[PDB]
Structures are given as structure tokens and as C-alpha cells.
């Protein structure tokens, strides 16, 4: 998990979602898994 | 001279409020009004001329938003790091009457008369209370329109 203030897609597979009042990036590549905090 | 309650002209009345599906703050405001006696034309701020207020179904009080888990009731024991916090939901689960009690007590004035007034509040975490002998009046919280 990449916990940074800014989360963005790192590839075309990454999708930005908002789960539990929190912007996150979900991807088939776990390396690109991000979270806002 | 303005009217002043003398000796035993303070007549007391018993009300019972059903806290089922009622907002905690609204119920506490109405109960504090009744316990102060602000609803009586003979109200004098230095006199405990309020009314007894039973609160039934205190466990079934309603709280909006996330107060049931995000709002905390705090107590410091006087010892270092002795701050215990219990969410409204946990407090309602463990001591259900205590949420309504705390709301009403906080809405009451903090002084000797306020603590005397507290004694007229009877919160119960169920549909029934033991004060049927007092013949309490069912009190529905109704707003006076303008």
C-alpha cells in the first residue's frame, strides 16, 4: 500500500475509487495499490 | 412585587416521556425544560419548581449521524492517563439510561439547584417504570408553532 496525500493511476489498469471516505487506487498490480492519508 | 414561591406553593407534577425513536438532544431539551419548570408561569430561577420526568425506553433513543460510534463520553479519574472514553453506542449498550441521563444533566444548569433538580429525573432503559403509583402524565414533545 502506498499511503500518500496524492494517489493517481500509475498504469491504465489502475482505477481510482473512494471507499470508506478515502480515495484509493486499486489495480491488478498490487504495487500500484495506493491510499490517501 | 413580583411573585415569589413561598413555603409549599410549589406543586410538582409527574411526566413520562417515551424516548423510543426520539432524538437524544430533543428529548434532553424537553426533559431539562420540564425539570427546570420553565413551562410554568410561576418559574423562578432560584427555586426547584420543576416537574418529575420519567424517561422510558431510554435504550431506544435515536442519535443521528455517526454519534453512535464517533461521539465519545469522557471521564477522567484524576490519575495520569486516566481518561476513559466510551462511545455513545457502547454507553447505550452497557448503561442505556446513562446517555439520556448525561444529555439531560448537561442541559441542566451546573450548580446546587441544578443538582437538586437532577433528583427529579428518572431514566429507565425499558418500556416500563416503577412509578405507576405517581400516575405520570404521558408527555409528548410538541413544538408550539408561531
Amino acid at each position: 500500500m502506498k499511503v500518500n496525500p496524492s494517489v493517481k493511476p500509475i498504469c491504465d489498469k489502475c482505477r481510482v475509487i473512494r471507499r470508506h471516505g478515502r480515495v484509493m487506487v486499486i489495480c491488478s498490480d498490487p504495487r500500484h495499490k495506493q491510499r490517501q492519508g | 412585587p413580583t411573585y415569589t414561591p413561598k413555603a409549599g406553593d410549589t406543586t410538582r407534577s409527574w411526566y413520562v416521556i417515551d424516548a423510543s425513536d426520539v432524538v437524544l438532544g430533543r428529548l434532553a431539551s424537553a426533559a431539562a425544560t420540564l425539570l427546570r419548570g420553565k413551562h410554568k408561569p410561576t418559574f423562578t430561577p432560584n427555586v426547584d419548581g420543576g416537574d418529575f420526568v420519567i424517561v422510558i425506553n431510554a435504550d431506544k433513543i435515536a442519535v443521528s449521524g455517526d454519534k453512535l460510534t464517533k461521539k465519545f463520553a469522557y471521564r477522567h479519574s484524576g490519575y495520569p492517563g486516566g481518561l476513559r472514553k466510551r462511545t455513545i453506542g457502547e454507553l447505550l449498550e452497557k448503561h442505556p439510561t446513562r446517555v439520556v441521563e448525561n444529555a439531560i444533566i448537561g442541559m441542566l444548569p451546573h450548580n446546587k439547584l441544578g443538582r437538586q433538580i437532577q433528583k427529579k429525573l428518572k431514566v429507565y432503559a425499558g418500556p416500563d417504570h416503577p412509578h405507576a403509583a405517581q400516575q405520570p402524565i404521558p408527555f409528548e414533545i410538541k413544538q408550539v408553532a408561531q
Binding site: - | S77, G78, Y79, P80, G82
Partner: protein
């Protein structure tokens, strides 16, 4: 659900195990306890059994206690103490006038022994809380056993509650847990409990079944 017996700390001694290992055992007179009263959730709101222990003279016993024992149906005894039980079947096991002997425990049973610790009197911080004493030499002026600092400065501005200071120590309830019962002398109504139990010799103790190592 949890056995227990009122007794007296007769003393302490040593026995030897089957492997010839020395076992320091407190000898406790787990004398007969008479069930005087049963606490129930219906009548009392909790489940407990009231036990009475020790021979006392009826002249010594006062009228309120004498009447309580009469209502129980048993002869008055010096001490009375309650054993709390979890469920109602535990008290369904008991009955007033019941005879509780040391045999309720068995050899090898782990018990919790509760007793009133010895009175150490007004103790200093070194004895009472293990405070590191200040230096015996190297300039130390009359602070060899004194607490040292008590608080901070202006910012707390006061001393916190629970500050470990000197005061009366001992004479408090202590429950030593998981003490093995080396032997149950049924003939003498005695228990040899491995280790030490709180209090002076002759003091009232409560030997309950171990709450942890049941």
C-alpha cells in the same frame, strides 16, 4: 463451578515429593465450613454461597449474628465469608447446613489462596515501593532513603494521584494464584499448599479453586 473453603494459615513447613524434591508448603487448616446462606440471583441478584468457619463461643457471638445463624439453622461460627460462583447450578450444588471439608480439594489441585497480608506499618518509599535509595555518600545530604523528586515544576504544578509515596503498607487483601495443593490431609482437615500464602500464621484465609488453572 468453583470450589472453596475457609481456613486458617496454621504455618509453613517443607515436605518431599515422589522425586525427593523439597516442596515448601504452607499448612492451612481448611477446617469444616458450614454453609449458612445461599445467595441467588432471584433473591440476591448474584450467585454465592455463604460459609461460616471457626469455633466461637455463643456468649461471644452477638444477637444479630446469633439470629442470622439461627435462621440458617446452624451453630454460630467465628468467621463468615461468601464464595462467588458464576452460574446458578453452582449454588444448586450447595445447601444450608452443608459440611465443607478439606477433601473438596484433591492433591495436585491448583488453588487461589486469599488472605490479609502482614502489617508492615507506616513504610518508607524504599520498603513500600522499591524506590532506589539515594547515595550513602558522595555528598548526599540526609536523602539516603527519601523519595527524590515528586513532580515536575510549574507545568503540572501539582502532584499526580497515585504518586508512590510513603505510608502504611500491608494488612491488605492478597490472592496468591495457582498454588498447587501438595497434599490433602483428610484426617486433620488440613491442606499442604505449595508455596506461601498471604498473612500471619493463624489468620483467616480463603482457599478457592484456581480461577486460571481450573
Amino acid at each position: 463451578a468453583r470450589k472453596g473453603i475457609l481456613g486458617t494459615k496454621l504455618g509453613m513447613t517443607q515436605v518431599f515429593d515422589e522425586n525427593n524434591k523439597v516442596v515448601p508448603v504452607t499448612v492451612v487448616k481448611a477446617g469444616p465450613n458450614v454453609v449458612t446462606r445461599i445467595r441467588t440471583t432471584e433473591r440476591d441478584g448474584y450467585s454465592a454461597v455463604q460459609l461460616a468457619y471457626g469455633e466461637i463461643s455463643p456468649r461471644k457471638v452477638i444477637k444479630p449474628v446469633a439470629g442470622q445463624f439461627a435462621a440458617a439453622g446452624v451453630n454460630p461460627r467465628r468467621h463468615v465469608a461468601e464464595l462467588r460462583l458464576d452460574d446458578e447450578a453452582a449454588v444448586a450444588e450447595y445447601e444450608v447446613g452443608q459440611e465443607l471439608t478439606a477433601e473438596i480439594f484433591s492433591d495436585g489441585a491448583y488453588v487461589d489462596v486469599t488472605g490479609t497480608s502482614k502489617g508492615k506499618g507506616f513504610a518508607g518509599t524504599m520498603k513500600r515501593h522499591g524506590f532506589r535509595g539515594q547515595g550513602a555518600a558522595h555528598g548526599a545530604q540526609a536523602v539516603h532513603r527519601r523519595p527524590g523528586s515528586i513532580g515536575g515544576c510549574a507545568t503540572p504544578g501539582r502532584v499526580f494521584k497515585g504518586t508512590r509515596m510513603s505510608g502504611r503498607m500491608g494488612n491488605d487483601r492478597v490472592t496468591t494464584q495457582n498454588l498447587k495443593v501438595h497434599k490433602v490431609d483428610a484426617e486433620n482437615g488440613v491442606l499442604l499448599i505449595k508455596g506461601a500464602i498471604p498473612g500471619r500464621n493463624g489468620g483467616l484465609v480463603v482457599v478457592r479453586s484456581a480461577i486460571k488453572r481450573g
